[PDB]
Structures are given as structure tokens and as C-alpha cells.
Design a protein around this ligand. Structure first.
Ligand SMILES: Cc1cc(-c2cn(CC(=O)Nc3cc(N4CCOCC4)ncc3Cl)c3ncn(CC#Cc4cnn(C)c4)c(=O)c23)cc(C#N)c1O
Ligand SMILES: Cc1cc(-c2cn(CC(=O)Nc3cc(N4CCOCC4)ncc3Cl)c3ncn(CC#Cc4cnn(C)c4)c(=O)c23)cc(C#N)c1O
Lengths: 122, 122
């Protein structure tokens, strides 16, 4: 019975990305080898099984720094972080393997499955 | 050139609402007369000109309690808060005026315009 606003969720996500771009209310830095990326824990939890499992635990919920596995490619992480905030996944031949492995680690199944589709289509 | 995930933003918003329902990483209580509502400031900012203007200001960004105008109907606020987190607006004959006035106060134009449409259609 409710009126549905079909662009609202996309508009929210765009505004959340705008807040990230201005470092407004970001509450964690994710450290990936020599690079650092600020984010909102709520968005990370919404998009990643790894981050969900980390921050749901009261033991870890208040952490302000998360150090990822040093084997994780920073570019691959950046691609996925941008995906979380945009719904747009930049997959190429040159990044597919890194992106797929990073998405497995972050526990992002739809991206992993899309990577499998990308592989099949080339 | 990016692959588009058409359900991702909706899925993010659903997960943010799930976090709200469990009081996970909520960072503000909004006080509306005798009622209180917990939320994520980032979502409020993403959906409301009033909350955007409040929390962007470094003077007010860290506030944990916001007291709304005592004239604001708590039910009307609740309807709009649920809209922010769901994209679904519960407009009825019995709540339209309160919802419209609350949306004006919260600076949520698309809802206000939809309220104007609802009035025109009855
Ligand atoms: C929106 C979105 C979410 C997830 C995704 C999020 N999460 C975390 C999660 O589930 N969070 C929440 C769950 C609930 N619940 C609802 C009520 O019932 C219980 C849960 N409530 C609030 C939050 Cl924040 C994910 N967690 C796991 N996976 C799966 C995976 C994987 C994988 C791939 N390879 N490997 C090794 C593992 C997800 O995809 C997401 C992945 C993608 C992708 N790709 C995506 O576009
Ligand atoms: C997604 C969504 C947003 C807004 C809405 C949000 N905001 C706050 C805002 O604009 N936040 C941000 C803006 C930017 N910028 C992008 C780059 O350029 C600058 C801005 N970046 C990040 C954030 Cl969080 C709104 N603020 C104002 N209004 C308009 C109004 C009104 C009104 C109605 N009656 N009265 C008296 C006032 C909005 O609708 C929204 C309203 C609705 C509705 N209905 C809706 O479904």
C-alpha cells in the first residue's frame, strides 16, 4: 500500500558517496599494504560479509583502523570500495583476477559471481 | 563502461535499515515530543536538508541528541524516518497533512511534492 520511490535508494547511495568524498562522518580507515582508505562502517557492513562479521562483534565494533591481509591488492580493494558506494563495477581484463580474489576475501558473492561471468565471456 | 548492479543500492538501504533495527552503529537519537528515535546521521544527511545542514556544520556534527521542534507530530516523523530507510512512503488521508508539514520541516522536497500530488488526487 506504500508509495514507492524508485530512485530514492540510488539517491541515498550517491549522497553517502558524496559524504565519503568529503570525509564527513567516516569512522574507519582501511589499511591495504601502503594505502589507506576512509569509509563508513555502516556501508562496509551493508556490502561485505567480512566487514559485517568484523563490526557486528562487540569486541571489534569500535575499531577505527582495520588492516587487511597484506596479500590484498590495493587497486582491487579500491575498485570494490567504489562499487559499494556506486553500484558500478569497473571490471577489465587487467584487473579481473585481483578484483575477483579481493571480492572473495571481502565476501561479496554477487561480485564474485559477476567475475565468474566475466571470465566465461572471455 | 562499468557494469551496473541494479539492485545494489536497494540492497544497501535494506541492510542499513536492518542495522537500525538492531541499533548497530546508530549515532544519534532524534527527540520528537515524548518519543525518541535512533538513527544513523549519514542516512539522515542523505535524505533531509534539515539534517544535512545540522551535521555538516562542524559546530553540530558530533551531537548525539537532536531535539526537533515540539510542534512536529511524532507519527509523521516516524513515517518519514521509515521512508528514508525503505523508499516506501505510507501516505493516507489521516496522515497526509502531518506528513507533508513534517517533510517541509525536514526539507524533503520529493516527499512534499508527492504530498501535493496526493492532495490533488483527492
Ligand atoms: C548489497 C551487497 C551486499 C553484499 C553482502 C553484504 N554482506 C553483509 C551482510 O549480509 N550484512 C547484513 C546482513 C543482515 N541480515 C539480514 C537478516 O538476516 C541475517 C542477515 N542485516 C544487516 C546487514 Cl549490514 C554480505 N555477507 C556475505 N555475502 C556472501 C559471500 C561471499 C563470498 C564470496 N566468496 N567468498 C569466499 C565468500 C555477501 O555477498 C554480502 C554483497 C554484495 C556484492 N557483491 C552487494 O552488492
Ligand atoms: C534521497 C532523498 C534526498 C532528499 C534530500 C536530501 N537532502 C540533503 C542533501 O542534499 N544532502 C547531501 C548533498 C550533497 N550535495 C551534492 C553536491 O552538491 C551539493 C549538495 N552531498 C551529500 C549530501 Cl548527504 C536534501 N536537502 C534539501 N532538499 C530539498 C527541500 C526542501 C523543502 C521542502 N519544503 N521545505 C520548506 C523545504 C531535499 O529534498 C533533500 C530528499 C528526499 C525526499 N523526499 C529523498 O528521497
Amino acid at each position: 500500500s506504500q508509495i514507492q520511490f524508485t530512485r530514492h535508494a540510488s539517491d541515498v547511495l550517491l549522497n553517502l558517496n558524496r559524504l565519503r568524498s568529503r570525509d564527513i562522518l567516516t569512522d574507519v580507515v582501511i589499511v591495504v599494504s601502503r594505502e589507506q582508505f576512509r569509509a563508513h562502517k555502516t556501508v562496509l557492513m551493508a556490502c561485505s560479509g567480512l566487514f559485517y562479521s568484523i563490526f557486528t562483534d562487540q569486541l571489534k565494533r569500535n575499531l577505527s583502523v582495520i588492516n587487511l591481509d597484506p596479500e590484498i591488492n590495493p587497486e582491487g580493494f579500491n575498485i570494490l570500495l567504489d562499487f559499494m558506494y556506486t553500484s558500478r563495477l569497473n571490471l577489465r581484463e587487467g584487473n579481473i583476477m585481483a578484483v575477483m580474489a579481493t571480492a572473495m576475501y571481502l565476501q561479496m558473492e554477487h561480485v564474485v559471481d559477476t567475475c565468474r561471468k566475466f571470465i566465461k565471456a572471455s
